[PDB]
């Protein structure tokens, strides 16, 4: 039989400064769990990578040294974006093999945002705490960890197609023979969960023809939401920019709308401040505001470094991952998201955005 929920638990960072407090299992106290309990390897990407920015960060940095000083394969995977750091990385850790990735080398506009851990197939995080000593003891993040070895697993599979897009000699980012003979695969999706968890993938051009795309499966939980849409990203505006040119996408963006006028549905909407000089914000801004007042729609701002992205959709399924609700995310970008059905972990997630929703760092939208 398998376990409820696949053993899963919440993890998030809430910095001292902040008035976040919660009973679950700390961000920092997560990965000295997984570097204590290694037994194999250990499997980390993100987009940047800073562990010494901060105290937490320098601590993990230190027992995962000692890590890969026992013999343990010690694999990090960084866009290749963030490469400023990594003559200061191999300095601290001669032993740990960094890599960069270029997922995206046609048009160089996807990124690696695959944040996630995974040691042993037996334990792994997944989350918006990228590798950086800010989103383990200063930005707020929110992710889960399991240690239920089908579950982490399956992402291990995950992590075996970004390390093909390495940036070395001829390999999946380079040739497209090589590209092809890739076994991307997944064991669990949206139409075979284990224990009520499966994961998303992204872009779609690394899906193969098994893996699930987050793109499709969250619009559909949007457009099938009949009381409750709850989401904590950074900013939902139809509008990016990608180099010096705006790129329209609202697709998630237009699947909120139609809840809450055709639906009906109390949605609760928690995004970041935006710029006042962005007049795509402003716009997105005074749309928003007008509903309101109209609809069940609610509205707050945060200013603080927060990398949160969730989405609870009528207690009865949660969306926690690592990209934003935007257009340059959700087409071009390579990362993978978290989904999860279990009434018990759905429970805790509401637990964690009625928390968020009411606290003094969430001002009301004023215009
Ligand atoms: O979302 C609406 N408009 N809108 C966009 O299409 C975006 C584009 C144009 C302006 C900004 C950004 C540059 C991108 C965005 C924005 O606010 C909107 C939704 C519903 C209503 C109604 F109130 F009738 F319910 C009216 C309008």
């Known amino acids: ?31 000295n769990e997984i570097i204590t309990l290694a037994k194999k390897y250990i499997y980390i990407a993100s987009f940047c990578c800073n562990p010494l920015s901060t105290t ?14 026992k013999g343990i394969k010690i694999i990090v995977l960084l866009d290749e974006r963030g490469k400023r750091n990594l003559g200061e990385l191999q300095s601290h850790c001669p032993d740990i093999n960094f890599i960069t990735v270029n997922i995206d080398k046609k048009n160089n506009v996807g990124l690696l945002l695959g944040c996630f851990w995974v040691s042993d197939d037996e334990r792994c995080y997944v989350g918006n705490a990228s590798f950086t000593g800010g ?6 993040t929110l992710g889960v960890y399991s240690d239920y070895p089908p579950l982490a697993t399956d992402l291990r599979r995950r992590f075996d197609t970004f390390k093909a897009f390495n940036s070395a000699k001829n390999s999946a980012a380079n040739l497209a023979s090589a590209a092809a003979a890739l076994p991307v695969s997944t064991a669990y999706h949206i139409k075979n969960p284990i224990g009520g968890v499966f994961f998303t993938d992204s872009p779609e051009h690394l899906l193969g ?11 559909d939980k949007l457009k099938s939401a009949k009381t409750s849409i709850d989401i904590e990203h950074l900013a939902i505006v139809p509008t990016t920019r990608v180099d010096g040119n705006s790129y329209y996408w609202p697709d998630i963006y237009n699947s909120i709308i139609e809840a809450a006028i055709n639906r009906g549905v109390k949605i609760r909407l928690l995004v970041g401040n935006w710029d006042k000089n962005d007049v795509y914000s402003m716009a997105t801004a005074r749309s ?5 007042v109209q609809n069940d729609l609610s509205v707050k701002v945060f200013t603080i470094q927060n990398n949160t992205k969730l989405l ?13 609700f935007d257009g340059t995310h959700y087409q071009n970008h390579g990362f993978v998201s978290f ?29």
């Not at 899963?8 to 902040?18: A, D, H, K, Q, Y």
């Not at 937490?56 to 000083?69: H, Q, V």
């Not at 989103?135 to 707020?140: C, E, G, M, N, V």
């Not at 795309?213 to 619009?219: H, S």
Request: aromatic share 8%; proline share 2%.
């Open 135 to 140: 989103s383990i003891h200063t930005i707020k």
């Open 209 to 219: 023809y098994s893996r699930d795309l987050d793109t499709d499966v969250v619009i």
């Open 288 to 292: 928003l505001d007008e509903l309101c």
């Open 339 to 367: 989904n999860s059905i279990d009434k018990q972990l759905v429970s805790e997630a509401k637990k964690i955005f009625e928390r968020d929703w009411v606290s003094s760092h969430s001002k009301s939208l004023k215009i």
């Open 312 to 324: 609870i959709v009528d207690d009865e399924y949660v969306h926690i991952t690592s990209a934003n």
């Open 56 to 69: 937490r960060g320098a601590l993990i940095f230190d027992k995962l040294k000692e890590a890969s000083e």
């Open 1 to 31: 039989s398998v376990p409820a929920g696949a053993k899963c638990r919440l993890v998030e960072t809430l910095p001292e400064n902040m008035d976040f407090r919660s009973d679950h299992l700390t961000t920092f106290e997560c990965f």
